[PDB]
Amino acid sequence: STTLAIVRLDPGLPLPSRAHDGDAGVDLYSAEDVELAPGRRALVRTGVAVAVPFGMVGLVHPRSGLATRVGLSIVNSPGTIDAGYRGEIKVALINLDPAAPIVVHRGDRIAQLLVQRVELVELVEVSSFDEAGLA
Amino acid sequence: TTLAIVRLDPGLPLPSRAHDGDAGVDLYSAEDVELAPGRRALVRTGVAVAVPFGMVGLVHPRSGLATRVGLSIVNSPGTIDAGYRGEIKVALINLDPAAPIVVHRGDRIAQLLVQRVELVELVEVSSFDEAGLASTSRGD
Amino acid sequence: MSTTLAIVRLDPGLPLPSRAHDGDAGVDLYSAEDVELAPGRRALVRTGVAVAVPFGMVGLVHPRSGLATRVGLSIVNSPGTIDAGYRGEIKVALINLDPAAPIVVHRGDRIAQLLVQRVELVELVEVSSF
């Protein structure tokens, strides 16, 4: 229902897509080949940049399959993609397994991007919650 | 908005909301597991849900255990698609350096939130300039 | 936008959290204390603020990506959940995910960011099958 303008910085990757009609997000690909030794991280390029609509927010989540099979994870999950950010999306992958290295290949689905509305609240300082009227 | 839930395992209580405005409901562990420092495990929660179309279920780590024993969830926030009718599982991991964590069946290991999600339609463009979506000053 | 979030600076010594750019998703929270994390160790840090999340909404504590990459800084229970009813101080479960370098956090540093979104306060209805 909502359109998202997306730019394939790396035309060699497939355009991210939604697997089923109600599926929460679209899987992002790795534009590079990387290997993580146990406990090490990396900042991988996905080869895409998005135009998140004002009032919404992009959110990068880890894939559960990999998370369990090989203990693959994202250091700053959920990664926040601001509506204004027009740069390339990057994933902070980390190997949380104790002994087995993870090998990521360019073309691999290494995360998923969800889009949600966000409340751009206005912060209003108060002295106390009682005074304001919130106890 | 109601969420149809099936207790695959009838021995566990039905998840519920502690207070009127609470974001989610704590899910239970249907099994007994012990995690060594740095090890993970996929635990069954004894429940399946029917997240409404246009929405998404989100599995978050409980903060109390997160601090006290360093308990966590590898793919947090876990995504539960509206079409998913399987059992909800939690990828627990022990992030503490030396103390093993013991999960007992009946323990509240995570919490389920439900939020609306934008079912976006991706439309590719060669640049953001033509559509007035360029971050000029911010420089991307 | 029109939704306002009541905030109390428990520690007045810190700046009020703010939004950097117009559509930015959250506001950076500060550390009210000095902490140092050896590799693999965690710490519950005070941010010096308490908020009143509107009913039907939820506060979400996210890790900052810069630090996540440069030094492997993370948050154990990310995304931290702040209930609309919670009126206590916001604390961040920081953890050092780097293998060998200690992370040093200074009071005044921006250690996380708070987002606010609406949440569906669903009513669960048990059914024997789908």
Ligand SMILES: O=c1ccn([C@H]2C[C@H](O)[C@@H](COP(=O)(O)OP(=O)(O)O)O2)c(=O)[nH]1
């Ligand atoms: O990062 C966080 C997460 C939670 N809370 C507080 C506010 C929220 O209302 C309460 C939520 O508790 P929880 O994280 O859901 O779990 P627990 O049951 O372990 O307290 O704890 C914080 O101060 N910081």
Ligand SMILES: O=c1ccn([C@H]2C[C@H](O)[C@@H](COP(=O)(O)OP(=O)(O)O)O2)c(=O)[nH]1
């Ligand atoms: O914490 C979680 C996350 C996901 N799921 C299930 C429900 C969801 O419909 C499906 C999502 O899979 P995913 O996270 O995209 O993983 P992958 O596609 O890598 O299998 O897995 C769970 O039971 N628990």
Ligand SMILES: O=c1ccn([C@H]2C[C@H](O)[C@@H](COP(=O)(O)OP(=O)(O)O)O2)c(=O)[nH]1
């Ligand atoms: O997984 C992620 C997270 C963030 N970003 C970019 C886009 C977003 O708009 C910006 C957000 O910066 P932040 O998370 O506030 O980082 P920091 O404050 O540490 O620089 O960084 C990515 O490309 N990938």
Ligand SMILES: [Mg+2]
């Ligand atoms: Mg998937």
Ligand SMILES: [Mg+2]
């Ligand atoms: Mg709780």
Ligand SMILES: [Mg+2]
């Ligand atoms: Mg920031």
